[PDB]
Amino acid sequence: STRKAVIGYYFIPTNQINNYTETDTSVVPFPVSNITPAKAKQLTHINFSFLDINSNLECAWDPATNDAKARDVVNRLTALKAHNPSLRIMFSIGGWYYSNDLGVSHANYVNAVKTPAARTKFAQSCVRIMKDYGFDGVDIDWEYPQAAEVDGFIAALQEIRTLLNQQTIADGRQALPYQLTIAGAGGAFFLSRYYSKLAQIVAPLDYINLMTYDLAGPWEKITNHQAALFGDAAGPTFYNALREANLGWSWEELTRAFPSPFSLTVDAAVQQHLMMEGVPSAKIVMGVPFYGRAFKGVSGGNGGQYSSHSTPGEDPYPNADYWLVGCDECVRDKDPRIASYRQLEQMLQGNYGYQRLWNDKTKTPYLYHAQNGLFVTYDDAESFKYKAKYIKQQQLGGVMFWHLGQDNRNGDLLAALDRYFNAADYDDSQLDMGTGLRYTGVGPGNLPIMTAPAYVPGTTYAQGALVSYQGYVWQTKWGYITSAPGSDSAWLKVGRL
């Protein structure tokens, strides 16, 4: 049917733009020329990252950027469209460094969306940047607007959408219209900031790209998979912050939607979006990491899973002990806590002491270094089989990943995703999704189809009785009930006919 989106970040820091070269990996590890025609054909979107919002409350490049070299880099990316008439070169505003609560530019995000006049100036600057540099759409990665800033954020997205639609008409771009996306939270704590207004946030978007990764990290006391598809009962659980969001729902409604504690998984984030009325599955994009998160000081017993650890959480990494054995990129980047898939393959292939293990519940791989007590959570072409099947079963919009430079040299992870979506001779009908824990929540937007006897006036219904009435299946919350379903508080709408 409709092609699944495959959205890959291209991240390049300012110093690499300013010294851009395609022939020295010690200066630019991943130049645009490494995105071969074959890789360009497997992508639908490249998110060029990151631009910012400046103190003038406009979308802007880092002011240290050499503009001529920035245009040259973007021009190399948009040249790739010659190989793929569906490909878009988006640009992303924000990211964690610029826009987190304590980030260097955070107040500019708050202020840019705060008033109608600020939103107009900001929205215009986004489309002006898009047109000036030749980008194909706008991606906003504010991590994350707080509950009080959400209305301004929503209005800013609405205003950008209108201006993008004007631009599509002006440029005759109906065959490849300018798009608007966001990187959205992939876990319930950050998601709770704007969850109650999710439908308004998603309405002006082509896609909401869920950051369904970093669900574990050195900031948690217990090692865990950072992007488990489904839950492992042996693993940690978390409070479900969504049950405290300002939804106006009843106790039964909140309880049915937000089991707590729950397993912090990719499936949980996807289902949490689908539960909200007005959030269509086709706009939800599943983020996946092309990197692993490494932990030290772990115990044995379960391959390093669910163990205490001694991994520093600070930025920058606080000393020069690059303890992730074999991770040469970690030495370059002065941080042993993140390793690209590219590097992880080499670490497993070399004489470095890792064993690749597989969790059949989470459907994700992990490395365990038994001698030194290291644990690495990552994703690979095998975990992507299950995530791709989930994307197709749940009718999601596609996949997003951070980032292109972390795929291996041959682009095997990107090629795998493209294969699972598009290869005629790939068959996952028999791929077993396992018995990992599913997120069981149901909300107004994902009522299951059900059948039940028609409601009968005058009948006294005990607690838990199910009836069909006026298009839906309803359940009594207590007994005995005689009211018509929907006329009072006694009936829970549990399914659709």
| Beta carbons of 188 and 275 less than 8 angstroms apart | no
Pair 18, 98 in one domain: yes
What's the CA gap between 493 and 60, in Å, rounded? 48
Nearest partner of 319 among 332, 336, 302, judged by Cα: 336
What's the CA gap between 380 and 426, in Å, rounded? 17
Tell me the β-bridge partners of 91.
Answer: 48, 138
Nearest partner of 258 among 274, 239, 277, judged by Cα: 239
What's the CA gap between 268 and 270, in Å, rounded? 6
Tell me whether residue 371 is in a domain: no
| Beta carbons of 185 and 193 less than 8 angstroms apart | yes
The answer to whether the Cα torsion of 348, 354, 356, 361 is positive or negative is: negative
Pair 456, 414 in one domain: no
Residue 492 belongs to domain spanning: 448-497
Pair 46, 114 in one domain: yes
Pair 89, 157 in one domain: yes
Tell me whether residue 246 is in a domain: yes
Looking up tokens 């396992």 gives: 434
Pair 386, 491 in one domain: no
What's the CA gap between 184 and 205, in Å, rounded? 11
97 is in an annotated binding site: yes
The Cβ of residue 200 has, within 10 Å, a number of other Cβ atoms equal to 18
Total residue length of the chain: 497
The Cβ of residue 464 has, within 10 Å, a number of other Cβ atoms equal to 11
Q: What residues contact 334, with CB distance under 8 A and at least 6 apart?
A: 316, 317, 320, 322
Nearest partner of 139 among 217, 196, 205, 75, judged by Cα: 205
| Beta carbons of 296 and 307 less than 8 angstroms apart | no
What's the CA gap between 157 and 198, in Å, rounded? 12
Determine phi and psi for 155, rounding to 5 degrees.
-65, -35
What's the CA gap between 330 and 347, in Å, rounded? 11
What's the CA gap between 250 and 257, in Å, rounded? 11
Pair 484, 410 in one domain: no
418 is in an annotated binding site: no
478 is in an annotated binding site: no
What's the CA gap between 388 and 363, in Å, rounded? 12
Tell me the β-bridge partners of 207.
Answer: 181
Tell me whether residue 260 is in a domain: yes
Tell me whether residue 403 is in a domain: yes
98 is in an annotated binding site: no
| Beta carbons of 446 and 434 less than 8 angstroms apart | no
What's the CA gap between 387 and 407, in Å, rounded? 17
Pair 397, 463 in one domain: no
Tell me the β-bridge partners of 211.
Answer: 185
Inter-CA distances, 193 with 59, 151, 185, 232, 356, Å: 23, 11, 9, 26, 37
The CATH number for 251's domain is: 3.20.20.80
Supply the angle between the helices 150-170 and 116-133 in degrees, to the nearest 10: 40
212 is in an annotated binding site: yes
- Chain-centre distance for alpha carbon 487: 39
Pair 87, 171 in one domain: yes
| Beta carbons of 104 and 98 less than 8 angstroms apart | yes
SS3 per residue for the chain: CCCCEEEEEEECCHHHHHCCCCCCCCCCCCCHHHCCHHHHHHCCEEEEEEEEECCCCCEECCCCCCHHHHHHHHHHHHHHHHHCCCCEEEEEEECHHHHCCCCCCHHHHHHHCCCHHHHHHHHHHHHHHHHHHCCCEEEEECCCCCHHHHHHHHHHHHHHHHHHHHHHHHCCCCCCCCEEEEEEECCHHHHCCCHHHHHHHHCCCCEEEEECCCCCCCCCCCCCCCCCCCECCCCCCECCHHHHCCCCCCHHHHHHHCCCCECCCHHHHHHHHHCCCCCCHHHEEEEEECEEEEECCCCCCCCCCCCCCCCCCCCCCCCCCCCCCCCHHHHHHCCCCEEEHHHHHHHHHCCCCEEEEEECCCCEEEEEECCCCEEEECCCHHHHHHHHHHHHHCCCCEEEEECHHHCCCCCHHHHHHHHHHHCCCCCCCCCCCCCCECCCCCCHHHCCECCCCECCCCCCECCCCEEEECCEEEEECCCCECCCCCCCCCEEEEEEC
Catalytic residue among 143, 149, 159, 329: 143
Tell me whether residue 363 is in a domain: no
Nearest partner of 109 among 117, 100, 137, judged by Cα: 100
**C-alpha Rg value of the chain to the nearest Å:** 24
67 is in an annotated binding site: yes
402 is in an annotated binding site: yes
- Per the structure, how many domains does the chain have? 2
Inter-CA distances, 345 with 25, 38, 132, 333, 334, Å: 19, 21, 40, 18, 19
What's the CA gap between 311 and 286, in Å, rounded? 28
Looking up tokens 């939103």 gives: 119
| Beta carbons of 183 and 260 less than 8 angstroms apart | no
What's the CA gap between 292 and 395, in Å, rounded? 27
Tokens encoding 99: 């826009």
* Method used experimentally: X-ray
Tell me whether residue 110 is in a domain: yes
Single-letter residue type at 234: A
Tell me the β-bridge partners of 182.
Answer: 140, 208
The reported resolution of this PDB entry, expressed in Å, is: 1.7
Tell me the β-bridge partners of 468.
Answer: 454, 473
Nearest partner of 223 among 317, 308, 323, 291, judged by Cα: 308
What's the CA gap between 358 and 373, in Å, rounded? 17
Tell me the β-bridge partners of 377.
Answer: 293, 366
Residue 143 appears among annotated catalytic residues: yes
Tell me whether residue 219 is in a domain: yes
Nearest partner of 211 among 290, 102, 292, 288, judged by Cα: 288
Pair 274, 196 in one domain: yes
Q: What residues contact 107, with CB distance under 8 A and at least 6 apart?
A: none
Tell me whether residue 328 is in a domain: no
The CATH number for 490's domain is: 2.10.10.20
358 is in an annotated binding site: no
Q: Judging by DSSP bridges, how do beta strands 472-476 and 491-496 pair with one another?
A: antiparallel
Inter-CA distances, 326 with 39, 288, 346, 353, Å: 27, 24, 8, 9
What's the CA gap between 317 and 331, in Å, rounded? 11
130 is in an annotated binding site: no
Tokens encoding 291: 């990197």
440 is in an annotated binding site: no
Pair 185, 262 in one domain: yes
What's the CA gap between 266 and 126, in Å, rounded? 31
Pair 413, 469 in one domain: no
Pair 493, 386 in one domain: no
